Symmetry: C4
Subunit: 90 residues, 4 copies
């Protein structure tokens, strides 16, 4: 659990660094600085408006943005759902 | 369960009190009274348009509103998911 | 499981009957007939756009509509999450 | 897990093939080719704007589209939730 939430903090920070670089200039409100990025990626992790709100408007400028976001979702969502069911049994 | 759902009820009322104060005058439709607040926070707990619908339009006036909402989400969401998985086992 | 999904079918049909009556005339696209109602309530059960999309536009005509929807959500969501974790162990 | 995720991959490809055919010409942005379809159906599996965003605008042209989408959701959502809860236990 302490390890799982260590992993996910690193994945979160690394993903927000990458996204700040990738989409910062084209999507300033969502990714213009690292703080805007950790927030948006938390939102994307909660699946809230991820495609209609974030990823489709992004794909109109970066057609392959799905290569970043979908695996990100798959990893954080699985890691969160592991952290939660971990803390419980623990 | 009985105690978990007591904790979550208190957290819920305290959060709705706090939010009524914090965002009530700037965001009356969502937080103008305690009843509007308990509803909106139930919605935020379900994750339904929490960011594009609530929190981003709020951060345009209160840039740190994320300090309230995100931990609220993390607490309730985890506590809810624990309450439900509790009830189930508690009948096994 | 067979019992749980019997309960939830009855709750679903009863809720869609009630909603067709309550919000049918004021909200025809969402509740104008029983079929429109079972669909909308499936959507509400998945939590998709439930408040910004359905319940808030409804509360502008029926202020207490939350008395119906919130318990409905609480019941179906708990029953679904019981049916799923049931089938698994079964 | 290895077999569950094989099943879900096949279901996913078959569904995206079917949807490309069914809704491709009426809804090109969402289903105009198999790649647009696999993406849109991943989104529908996450429940993200599935009804207000996808399925309701689709039912305005294909009134029975719900016969495809709802069972798709029920199948993938259940299978995904089974795959994840499988992996976890499979390492206990
Ligand atoms: C899992 C851990 C997730 C952690 C999430 C932390 C987010 C941090 C956000 C932050 O520090 N902000 C600055 C607050 O001063 C908010 C920014 O996102 C900001 O640039 C804008 O989004 C808004 O201010 C627009 O109104
Ligand atoms: C987990 C427990 C969550 C409990 C949630 C209780 C919500 C109570 C809402 C309520 O009592 N209202 C007043 C009913 O008279 C509705 C208000 O939220 C209202 O100000 C507006 O949202 C609408 O009327 C808009 O048209
Ligand atoms: C858990 C079980 C959930 C079952 C859900 C079943 C929904 C049945 C919907 C149905 O039979 N329709 C008629 C199809 O002919 C669709 C209606 O909802 C319709 O009145 C409109 O919504 C659209 O046609 C608008 O374009
Ligand atoms: C579970 C596995 C899910 C796999 C999902 C794969 C999606 C593949 C998407 C893809 O290959 N695209 C082409 C990239 O060149 C993107 C398309 O969906 C595209 O037609 C549009 O959506 C955007 O380009 C809009 O601007
Ligand atoms: Br809930
Ligand atoms: Br997923």
């Amino acid at each position: 659990v302490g390890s799982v939430a260590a992993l996910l903090t690193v994945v979160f920070y690394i993903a927000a660094v990458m996204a700040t670089n990738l989409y910062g200039a084209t999507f300033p409100e969502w990714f213009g600085d690292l703080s805007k990025s950790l927030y948006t990626l938390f939102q994307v992790m909660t699946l809230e408006s991820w495609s209609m709100g974030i990823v489709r408007p992004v794909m109109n400028v970066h057609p392959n943005a799905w290569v970043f976001f979908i695996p990100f979702i798959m990893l954080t969502t699985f890691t969160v759902l592991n952290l939660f069911i971990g803390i419980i049994v623990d």
